[PDB]
Write a sequence for this structure.
């Protein structure tokens, strides 16, 4: 699996066990992702922080 990094023109290959890509962002500014990469479990979205997870190449 491949996922994009903070600057989406750059990407990486996930290590074993991380079969999800993710994009994190502050709920009030959803067009500015503050973090991106590979993860194993999709983090729990809270009141102020939202996470979008997906499982296909450079989907985040
Ligand atoms: C011998 C040397 C030469 C080797 C061959 C050449 C290639 C070497 C490649 C080396 C690098 C591969 C590993 C890199 C993994 C990282 O890219 C990615 C980055 O993913 C995300 O990137 C985002 C930014 O774009 C954020 O930083 C995320 O941060 S966070 O908040 O989610 O934590 C971060 O999760 N992951 C990490 O760095 C994490 O620390 C990975 C921790 C979990 C993987 C290691 C433990 C796996 C479980 C092993 C259990 C026992 C069986 C192991 C079987 C596999 C054996 C073979 C080795 C596998 C090694 C995997 C690294
Ligand atoms: O252009 C912004 C929209 O691009 C589409 C994908 O969304 C990711 C936006 O973050 C891109 C990285 O920040 C901008 C500078 O690079
Ligand atoms: C662009 C495709 C990459 C495919 C390989 C995925 C693993 C990449 C490992 C890191 O890149 C290795 C080659 O670069 C040599 C230096 O390695 C250190 C990299 O440090 C991380 C900073 O570079 C990325 C900058 O972008 C920041 C996030 O947008
Ligand atoms: O599962 C995730 C549940 O998330 C619930 C909140 O909604 C997430 C998506 O938010 C999209 C952006 O909403 C911006 C709201 O702020 C509006 C300010 O005018
Ligand atoms: C700086 C002023 C502090 C005032 C404190 C006293 C008044 C507090 C009133 C509001 O209390 C609300 C409940 O707070 C509970 C603890 O906060 C947790 C917030 O989590 C937000 C995201 O959770 C969303 C639901 O998650 C469900 C499981 O995924």
């Amino acid at each position: 699996l491949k996922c994009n990094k903070l600057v989406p023109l750059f990407y990486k290959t996930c290590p074993a066990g991380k079969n999800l890509c993710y994009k994190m962002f502050m709920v009030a500014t959803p067009k500015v992702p503050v973090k991106r990469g590979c993860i194993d479990v999709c983090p729990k979205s809270s009141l102020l922080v939202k996470y979008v997870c997906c499982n296909t190449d450079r989907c985040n």
